[PDB]
Design a binder for this molecule. Structure first.
Ligand SMILES: CN1CCc2nc(C(=O)Nc3ccccc3CNC(=O)c3ccc(Cl)s3)sc2C1
Ligand SMILES: [Ca+2]
Ligand SMILES: [Ca+2]
Lengths: 233, 54
């Protein structure tokens, strides 16, 4: 995350972190329930073997609340394509159930039509993660979050050098130096409605991070609510 | 002119749908629709979508 603020205690409890063999974060996820994590299909190519850490806010320190889970089943969307990042979605079933507690809680899955008419028409959503804090930088050791304006679909297509499919949407700022970034990939874009947070996007890709005239590109979770439901059984 | 679900979400806490010409509220998994048919009450601990305070 470029710009934004630290997640304070209890603020980003649905954040998950995919960690490789070196115990280093390389992508995020969103906790959907005690057995399931939502992430980006593209993240599955960034490590051969990985685990999921929940409850972490500072990778330098052990706050006693962190827990690692092994992945039992990887469910990757069969239409994901590297060339455009279309269908950038995967669901992970964990071997053991997550213990909800301080800093560990699921985000709500909304209903499709209400989400499109009511959540995605709000002014903003919130993206979070342990990704780079500037385009050329290292991964954050602190969990961060950032309020990101929803961007008009026409403006987004005009801004982009790559195709924006209907499985994608745009959020962020035209020129203000705030965005998600590499390593936030796979992580939560949620939209608050009356103090309840619903998952609305998956961090997917961007042309750099926080570049002028460019936006963050998110997987449109409402395009996949049925698929997500099927995947979780 | 905003009517039903387009007027302040039909007064629903969460999901709003329009059936016949009327508002019907409902709630995410782990919540129960209250007696007033509008609020959503968490059924157990750690209901989805809530920032943690314990
Ligand atoms: C179709 N392609 C998929 C991958 C791709 N990567 C492209 C690219 O420029 N990558 C690139 C180059 C330098 C720094 C960071 C990135 C990736 N940035 C992010 O992941 C995000 C920023 C905001 C959010 Cl939301 S995620 S451009 C491109 C197009
Ligand atoms: Ca820690
Ligand atoms: Ca920009």
């Amino acid at each position: 995350i470029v710009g934004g603020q630290e997640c304070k205690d209890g603020e980003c409890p649905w954040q998950a972190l995919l960690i490789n063999e070196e115990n280093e974060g390389f992508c995020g996820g969103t906790i959907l329930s005690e057995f399931y994590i939502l992430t980006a299909a593209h993240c599955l190519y960034q490590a051969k073997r990985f685990k999921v850490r929940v409850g972490d806010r500072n990778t330098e320190q052990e706050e006693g609340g962190e827990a690692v889970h092994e992945v039992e089943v990887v469910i990757k969307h069969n239409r994901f394509t590297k060339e455009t990042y279309d269908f950038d979605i995967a669901v992970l079933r964990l071997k053991t159930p997550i213990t909800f507690r301080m800093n560990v809680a699921p985000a709500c899955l909304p209903e499709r039509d209400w989400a499109e008419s009511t959540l995605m028409t709000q002014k903003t959503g919130i993206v979070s993660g342990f990704g780079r804090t500037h385009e050329k930088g290292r991964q954050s050791t602190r969990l961060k979050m950032l309020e990101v304006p929803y961007v008009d679909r026409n403006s987004c297509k005009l801004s982009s050098s790559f195709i924006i499919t209907q499985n994608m949407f745009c959020a962020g700022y035209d020129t203000k130096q705030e965005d998600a970034c590499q390593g936030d990939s796979g992580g939560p874009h949620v939209t608050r409605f009356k103090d309840t947070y619903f998952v609305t996007g998956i961090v997917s890709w961007g042309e750099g991070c926080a570049r002028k005239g460019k936006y963050g590109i998110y997987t449109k979770v409402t395009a996949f609510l049925k698929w997500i439901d099927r995947s979780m059984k | 002119t905003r009517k039903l679900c387009s007027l302040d979400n039909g007064d629903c806490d969460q999901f709003c749908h329009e059936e016949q010409n009327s508002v019907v509220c409902s709630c995410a998994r782990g919540y129960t629709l209250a007696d007033n048919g509008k609020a959503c009450i968490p059924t157990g601990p750690y209901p989805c979508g809530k920032q943690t305070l314990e």
